[PDB]
Every structure is written in structure tokens, then in C-alpha cells.
């Protein structure tokens, strides 16, 4: 159910080499809140990769602490997938957390590296969130 305390979801960004704007995945519900993968180019140069939580809500009373593993899938060999962990208290003023320089753009888009195929790159997030505050009273 959406009240689950954790989950793993993926989002495949197409026409990756041409990415120019920030892109958002559909939501994955955890602790009944919508979580999304956010990817954006940073300085070509580097891949920006962030985890976003409950960003569309106009509430300013909510908060949810969570730890997560942000990973860029290596389709040729999963042991080569690259990941970084985060731990953050998400709330309206800090609704996303991650790395602007998650990986070098040149490396992720390198066809010989195994992360890109048909100009597509798959992002994955394993999020373990605590019970939120200021949502369901």
C-alpha cells in the first residue's frame, strides 16, 4: 500500500544526450507521500540527480525524514551501477535533496561505459522514510 515505509522505483530518461531542462518522474508513494526522481544537466558537464518529496502540496506544516540510495543503473553490469546515499529531513523549504554533480556527464553518456543505451539512462531510488509529521493528524 501507499503507506509502505520504503520502496524502490525507477525512471528512464530518454533522449538523454539532449537533456536541457530539469525532468521529473511520476510519483512513487511512500508513507502516503509522493516521491519523485529529478534529473537535470549541471555545470553537459555533470548529471544532477535529486530525490524530491511532496513538492506540489501547498502545505507548510509537513516534514518527513528519510534515507535513500540514488543510483544510476549500468545496464551491462549492475555491479557497475553507480550510487550515492542521502539522509535528509524533507519539508516545504527543502523538498528535494541530492547531488548536482552526481556523475560526470561525459562518463554517463559514454557508450562504452554501459550506462546509456539508445540515448536512454535509467535512474533508481531506494527510499526508506520515517512516519511524516504535519500531514495526517
Amino acid at each position: 500500500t501507499s503507506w509502505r515505509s520504503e520502496a524502490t522505483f525507477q525512471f528512464t530518461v530518454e533522449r538523454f544526450s539532449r537533456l536541457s531542462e530539469s525532468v521529473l518522474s511520476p510519483p512513487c508513494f511512500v508513507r502516503n507521500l509522493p516521491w519523485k526522481i529529478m534529473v537535470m544537466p549541471r555545470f553537459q558537464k555533470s548529471v544532477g540527480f535529486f530525490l524530491q518529496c511532496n513538492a506540489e502540496s501547498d502545505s507548510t506544516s509537513w516534514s518527513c525524514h528519510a534515507q535513500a540510495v540514488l543510483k544510476i543503473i549500468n545496464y551491462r553490469d549492475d555491479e557497475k551501477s553507480f550510487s550515492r546515499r542521502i539522509s535528509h529531513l524533507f519539508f516545504h523549504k527543502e523538498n528535494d535533496w541530492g547531488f548536482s554533480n552526481f556523475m560526470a556527464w561525459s562518463e554517463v553518456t559514454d557508450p562504452e561505459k554501459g550506462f546509456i543505451d539508445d540515448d536512454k539512462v535509467t535512474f533508481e531510488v531506494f527510499v526508506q522514510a520515517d512516519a511524516p509529521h504535519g500531514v495526517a493528524w
Binding site: 544532477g48 550515492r84 546515499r85 539522509s87 535533496w97 541530492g98 547531488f99 548536482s100
Partner: peptide
């Protein structure tokens, strides 16, 4: 994992 932050 090297200094996580907001977008």
C-alpha cells in the same frame, strides 16, 4: 556520497 544538497 559527497555533500548532498538541494537542487
Amino acid at each position: 556520497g559527497a555533500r548532498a544538497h538541494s537542487s
